[PDB]
Design an enzyme around this catalytic site. Structure first.
Site, mmCIF file in Angstrom:
data_model
loop_
_atom_site.group_PDB
_atom_site.id
_atom_site.type_symbol
_atom_site.label_atom_id
_atom_site.label_comp_id
_atom_site.label_asym_id
_atom_site.label_seq_id
_atom_site.Cartn_x
_atom_site.Cartn_y
_atom_site.Cartn_z
ATOM 1 N N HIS A 96 -18.277 -101.347 -71.178
ATOM 2 C CA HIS A 96 -19.728 -101.293 -70.417
ATOM 3 C C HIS A 96 -20.838 -101.363 -71.262
ATOM 4 O O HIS A 96 -21.953 -101.486 -70.853
ATOM 5 C CB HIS A 96 -19.589 -100.342 -69.333
ATOM 6 C CG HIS A 96 -19.731 -98.842 -69.771
ATOM 7 N ND1 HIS A 96 -19.230 -97.679 -69.646
ATOM 8 C CD2 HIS A 96 -20.952 -98.248 -70.752
ATOM 9 C CE1 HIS A 96 -19.360 -96.725 -70.278
ATOM 10 N NE2 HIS A 96 -20.525 -97.043 -70.915
ATOM 11 N N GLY A 120 -25.660 -91.461 -72.927
ATOM 12 C CA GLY A 120 -25.248 -91.645 -74.167
ATOM 13 C C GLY A 120 -24.101 -91.409 -74.745
ATOM 14 O O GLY A 120 -23.726 -91.437 -76.115
ATOM 15 N N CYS A 166 -20.922 -91.646 -73.843
ATOM 16 C CA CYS A 166 -19.902 -92.781 -73.674
ATOM 17 C C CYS A 166 -19.447 -93.022 -74.963
ATOM 18 O O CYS A 166 -20.012 -93.210 -76.091
ATOM 19 C CB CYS A 166 -20.390 -93.957 -72.956
ATOM 20 S SG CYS A 166 -21.345 -93.697 -71.590
HETATM 21 C C1 LIG Z 1 -24.267 -91.264 -63.182
HETATM 22 C C2 LIG Z 1 -24.139 -92.700 -63.829
HETATM 23 C C3 LIG Z 1 -25.194 -93.603 -63.192
HETATM 24 C C4 LIG Z 1 -22.595 -93.085 -63.463
HETATM 25 N N1 LIG Z 1 -24.199 -92.399 -65.309
HETATM 26 C C5 LIG Z 1 -23.435 -92.224 -66.053
HETATM 27 O O1 LIG Z 1 -22.120 -92.359 -66.142
HETATM 28 C C6 LIG Z 1 -24.024 -92.148 -67.543
HETATM 29 C C7 LIG Z 1 -23.206 -90.835 -68.126
HETATM 30 C C8 LIG Z 1 -24.100 -89.602 -68.038
HETATM 31 C C9 LIG Z 1 -23.508 -88.383 -68.449
HETATM 32 C C10 LIG Z 1 -22.298 -88.705 -69.181
HETATM 33 N N2 LIG Z 1 -21.569 -89.639 -69.086
HETATM 34 C C11 LIG Z 1 -22.238 -90.792 -68.771
HETATM 35 N N3 LIG Z 1 -23.960 -93.298 -68.357
HETATM 36 C C12 LIG Z 1 -24.342 -93.069 -69.800
HETATM 37 O O2 LIG Z 1 -24.694 -92.195 -70.315
HETATM 38 C C13 LIG Z 1 -24.398 -94.513 -70.592
HETATM 39 C C14 LIG Z 1 -23.936 -95.938 -70.471
HETATM 40 C C15 LIG Z 1 -24.132 -96.562 -71.323
HETATM 41 C C16 LIG Z 1 -24.610 -95.637 -72.441
HETATM 42 O O3 LIG Z 1 -24.606 -94.282 -71.844
HETATM 43 C C17 LIG Z 1 -23.415 -94.354 -67.816
HETATM 44 C C18 LIG Z 1 -22.389 -94.931 -68.111
HETATM 45 C C19 LIG Z 1 -21.552 -96.219 -67.428
HETATM 46 C C20 LIG Z 1 -22.438 -96.858 -66.727
HETATM 47 C C21 LIG Z 1 -21.979 -98.155 -65.768
HETATM 48 C C22 LIG Z 1 -20.272 -98.315 -66.096
HETATM 49 C C23 LIG Z 1 -22.219 -98.130 -64.443
HETATM 50 C C24 LIG Z 1 -22.603 -99.477 -66.699
HETATM 51 C C25 LIG Z 1 -23.673 -96.429 -66.484
HETATM 52 C C26 LIG Z 1 -24.322 -95.290 -67.085
#
Ligand SMILES: CC(C)(C)NC(=O)[C@@H](c1cccnc1)N(C(=O)c1ccco1)c1ccc(C(C)(C)C)cc1
Ligand SMILES: CC(C)(C)NC(=O)[C@@H](c1cccnc1)N(C(=O)c1ccco1)c1ccc(C(C)(C)C)cc1
Lengths: 306, 306
Positions: free
Chosen positions: A41, A143, A145
């Site tokens: 992603h 961030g 991830c």
């Molecule tokens: C609530 C949601 C919108 C799904 N946010 C996250 O998943 C956070 C995140 C926040 C806190 C802990 N882990 C992930 N999140 C992120 O922090 C992120 C994405 C890229 C770098 O950091 C995130 C993970 C995946 C995505 C997708 C697959 C939709 C592209 C988008 C964002």
């Protein structure tokens, strides 16, 4: 004496953390030998997290589309491939700090250490369980991830989790190091939610054994139970059914303490039915379910106060 | 989202752990530059742990009386001195893995990470607080002596604890890296026991702020309190008195959440008086007191769910 949620020392994993950037997105990568692993992603456009076609998004990229930094050193990407929900990035340098390692897929109930990381930089370490609903109750911010979960045995790192996303309830979802999600989750924005969870019965029992090992017997009783009668009660309280396999696993602990598993089950059945009556076990009022029988044997004395 | 007891990554401390042996006694040492630090009780005879004279026991030793091993490398001791309750061993090699470091003496209520070690080999890492009674509720077995407690800030390791002994109640006592014990404890076998403990009021409050930051407000109320009226209640429940200094420290958290400190104090006073009414806060039924306000700001989002 004492009993703490204990993580594995993180040094071996720390020396493997890097930063991976594609366009405006940055997250963490895992650098082993000449490969960097990261969530796919990272290539997702900000414009549609809703309907990404990763095969399609990926052909549009070259090796130099990916920026990889280990500390203040840039790692040249010389190959890339997708494996399930991860990207496998070939780099020009083998990590001189690569520990002996394995990739394992853990099962629900099993525990691991998480090295929380941001911008390739480790920030903290904590212990977690894989929940029966295939989520983890992590502590992760934007961030995070690409942060990894792991166990260590005789200087070999068993990597078991890479972090992908947070669910509406604030719990976390991710993959093994082959990129296969734990649970029914997908790496895009949908209406997906964590399924109903249950308590890890085996772990509660392990922890009662730990409490006895450490010198406390208050919750024991004069009763026994059949496996079947236990499950009828346990399932009323949203506990996972206990199987003979779980009974077997608890053999070494049972032998160390002299308490029959079904006797400990009777004790647990009473705790469920009657409550705690104030009272704590190893400093806790809730029955703890994030220590495995292996975690207990590892942390506790082999003697028994007793 | 999420909130976990979180330790600092341990890699920098791991590269400093060694084994120190004098006669039949082995424990852990801390190797920084060309010095190895360890508990002086390493030179104590098994015959009398009761009345050791360390000055007298120490003159009877030479440099080669001390065996120091880093991994599978023997470190030649070329000097020794006593500093309070530690031995400072000069070695022929500077630790190439010495991180930027400081020695700090922490105060009761403050938290740190512990790297549990046996035979110079790190086994686990967990987070602890210095209790008001100057003990820590660690998880330590025989041979854990010389394990260290630490915090990390911008790649500098602040060492604050070295483990010395376990007390009758199963809690732990030790020193700063100048060898001065925390608390009234001494490194010999006496009738010494941990003094009465209290709850770290400031930390409970920090943790209520964390719970609000993460999106939960159930325990708040329409009331305020004076500092004095709060202390009269709080001290009835064995909580430390809150001072204006503690009120000040909670300023940044108060500002992030928009909740006045004395308003959060009123909330806490109600929780103490009424109980939890079932109900949890960040997954917990007991009011947690081993997170500082600094720990909360570090782990939680800077935004506020909200
Ligand atoms: C609530 C949601 C919108 C799904 N946010 C996250 O998943 C956070 C995140 C926040 C806190 C802990 N882990 C992930 N999140 C992120 O922090 C992120 C994405 C890229 C770098 O950091 C995130 C993970 C995946 C995505 C997708 C697959 C939709 C592209 C988008 C964002
Ligand atoms: C209960 C008591 C007899 C005091 N045991 C310990 O303190 C354990 C110990 C056990 C578990 C965790 N930490 C220390 N303990 C030890 O494990 C130990 C001593 C040397 C290497 O390991 C210990 C520490 C100090 C002493 C004195 C100062 C009396 C010489 C003796 C033993």
């Amino acid at each position: 004496s004492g009993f703490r949620k204990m993580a594995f020392p993180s040094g071996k994993v720390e020396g493997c953390m890097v930063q991976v950037t594609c366009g405006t997105t940055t997250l963490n990568g895992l650098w082993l030998d000449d490969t960097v692993y990261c969530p796919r992603h990272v290539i997702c456009t900000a414009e549609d997290m809703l309907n990404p076609n990763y095969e399609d998004l990926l052909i549009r990229k070259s090796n130099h589309s990916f920026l990889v930094q280990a500390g203040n050193v840039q790692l040249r990407v010389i190959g890339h491939s997708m494996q399930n929900c991860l990207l496998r990035l070939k780099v020009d340098t083998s990590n001189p700090k690569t520990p002996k390692y394995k990739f394992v897929r853990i099962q629900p109930g099993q525990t691991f250490s998480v090295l929380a990381c941001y911008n390739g930089s480790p920030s903290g370490v904590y212990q977690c369980a894989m929940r029966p609903n295939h989520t983890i109750k992590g502590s992760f911010l934007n961030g995070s991830c690409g942060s990894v979960g792991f166990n260590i045995d005789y200087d070999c790192v068993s990597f078991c989790y890479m972090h992908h996303m947070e669910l509406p309830t604030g719990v976390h979802a991710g993959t093994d190091l082959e990129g296969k999600f734990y649970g029914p989750f997908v790496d895009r924005q949908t209406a997906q939610a964590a399924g109903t969870d249950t308590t890890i019965t085996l772990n509660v029992l392990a922890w009662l054994y730990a409490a006895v090992i450490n010198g406390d017997r208050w919750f024991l009783n004069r009763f026994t139970t059949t496996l079947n009668d236990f499950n009828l009660v346990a399932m009323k309280y949203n506990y996972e059914p206990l199987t003979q396999d779980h009974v077997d696993i608890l053999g070494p602990l049972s032998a160390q303490t002299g308490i029959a598993v079904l006797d400990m089950c009777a004790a647990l059945k009473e705790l469920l039915q009657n409550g705690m009556n104030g009272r704590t076990i190893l400093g806790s009022t809730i029955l703890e379910d994030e220590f495995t029988p292996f975690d207990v044997v590892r942390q506790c004395s082999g003697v028994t106060f007793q």
